[PDB]
Homo-oligomer: 264 residues x 3
């Protein structure tokens, strides 16, 4: 851009600073503020009273509700105004009072959110987080700095995830929990600090996983949590199992990324 | 209406859409948005920065504080824009960032709030909830879909009530709790998941319950929780006790509505 | 004042009521409301969408983010509109949706916040609280009425502190906690209800405490929590220890103020 498409609507009370890019059939509602380094994709709606600023790219067909703050200065004590970034994909529902903060130089400079996510009232995405696709952050859920939340994962209401933790794909974290370590893919976690409670079987079933994939995932879970062996001992057994059941590879990929140890 | 009473005040910066009904001596503050299917009763005040929309009826002498969202699209994954409803009674104090969402077709189409309630900062009332009269939802308290909160009940700060649960009349739920089942009237509940901790005796005393009513309620509580009998066994004993002490009937009425089992 | 300094900026969309005092190089952003009894110090910024009202004094070089409410009517059930007060010092970072409420007549009439504090998203400071200097209240942290939070103390995310409690200097309260009694200075507290978990040693080290001061503080901690003696018995032993190690005096000063008993 730096231009507002002729088919975009900008409310007379909104303040869209010169340099902002606004795509076709987007809608900027009353009392919105949009900074000059913001890009808003085709079909995206900011309902009213939304602040979007920083070097922030937002994709298509998003709906962003009142009192949300996107691209804002993060809460890291070292941050000092560096031109860091936020990227948000397509078809996200970003509800009232959601906060998504910009990255830090030290943390890699980017906070990223994928597509088809539901971020419920007052959900918080800290500096340097990566949220994937089709995730749900329930009311008042909070991701601290540098947290990853992989595809399909759900974070229950009033749950806090501690800095640097990885929440694996298809994880379900129960409400009123505090997650202090990494959560392998496909697992249910609950408590404070959260501990594992088996495989997210209902989730996998609903998402079309085969009988064989669910059994294999359960077997990888048992290797980690029931076998009594060390993680070092089970890593090759899991890779071996993944030679037949491709879904089990998700564990191997996760172990490579994990830095905080596993919830146990 | 669809009209604004001559004695109502609408701030020049507020946006009240044609069709909205606004009663005598009501006050719509700066930067408020009021949709065309909203009705606002006599004496009601929207302080500033309030969004009210949907098919939403609001009674008299309410005070609604900045950054609250009333009548908004709910967070149910099946909701698709159906013209569902919110009803709010009289003399409620609805504090900053409160969210009250509209109902779902599947859930019965109505979210309802009574009168003389205090909804503290960031309290959340989900689709299809029913809050009665003289209730208190403390800071960050969250009601999931289809939750009932009966007269005089108090929900402590940072407490989540799970979908479909019934919180009985005069219940006190402690802070930092997660309520996963139904709570009988007159009971104190605390923890995650919350468990019963006797009768809300101080509450009943302050509200003018007689010595005999408090004793009778304690006896119904003991039948449920101390006697060792099944709920099926105690139901007739409680109804029998209610033949003398009318306040005990609240239990019978509650059992008829309960669907999630009792906190134990 | 009651005047706006010639070097202050007030956005054309802001509503600053006649009588408000606004200092040099202050900045009142779009859609802000500032009441007539507000004083805003030199260099203070209200980003946008901020409500400041009541008899409220705000110092220099503060940054107050969107959707924060400062000076607002408190949530005490007895409050009835009395002209009570808020005082806020210098160089505070007050993040999105923070609420700081005015005092009560019964509680002493003042809510006070010092300098160099970080109040993270949705932090809550109730009527009659006193927050000192260099404190941190993390996301969704909540102080109930009449709570004191002394210098350097940190309150973790989603943590509630109960009414009248004192949190001592250099305390660290972990996330997802509920603090129901007083916390001595220099202590780590965690849980619901929170219990003590030793001295905040890492905090003291980073803040430049000497080897001897840290040892002495640990010895006072052991007197309270390990010795098996009553608090009455240890008070003179702690005062005796403070004759050599001045930092230990913080305990004696704290005991004098404490009213709720100690977390144990």
């Amino acid at each position: 851009g730096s231009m507002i498409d002729k088919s975009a609507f900008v409310h007379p009370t909104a303040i869209v600073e010169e340099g902002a890019s606004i795509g076709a059939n987007a809608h900027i509602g009353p009392f919105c503020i949009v900074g000059p380094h913001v890009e808003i994709g085709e079909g995206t709606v900011l309902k009213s009273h939304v602040v979007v600023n920083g070097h922030t790219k937002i994709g298509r067909d998003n709906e962003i509700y009142q009192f949300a703050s996107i691209g804002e200065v993060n809460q890291d004590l070292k941050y000092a105004g560096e031109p860091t970034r936020v990227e948000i994909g397509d078809r996200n529902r970003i509800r009232e009072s959601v906060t998504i903060h910009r990255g830090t130089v030290q943390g890699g400079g980017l906070t990223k959110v994928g597509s088809d996510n539901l971020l419920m009232i007052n959900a918080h995405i800290a500096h340097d987080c990566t949220v994937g696709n089709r995730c749900i952050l329930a009311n008042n859920a909070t991701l601290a700095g540098h947290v990853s939340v992989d595809d399909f994962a759900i974070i229950g209401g009033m749950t806090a995830v501690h800095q640097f933790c990885i929440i694996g794909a298809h994880v379900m974290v129960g409400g009123c929990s505090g997650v202090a370590q990494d959560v392998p893919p496909y697992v249910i976690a609950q408590g404070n600090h959260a501990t594992p409670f088996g495989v997210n079987i209902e989730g996998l079933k609903r998402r079309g996983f085969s009988r064989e994939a669910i059994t294999a995932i359960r077997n990888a879970y048992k290797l980690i949590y029931r076998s009594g062996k060390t993680l070092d001992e089970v890593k090759p057994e899991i890779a071996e199992l993944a030679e037949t059941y491709p879904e089990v590879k998700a564990f191997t990929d996760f172990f490579a990324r994990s830095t905080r140890g596993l919830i146990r």
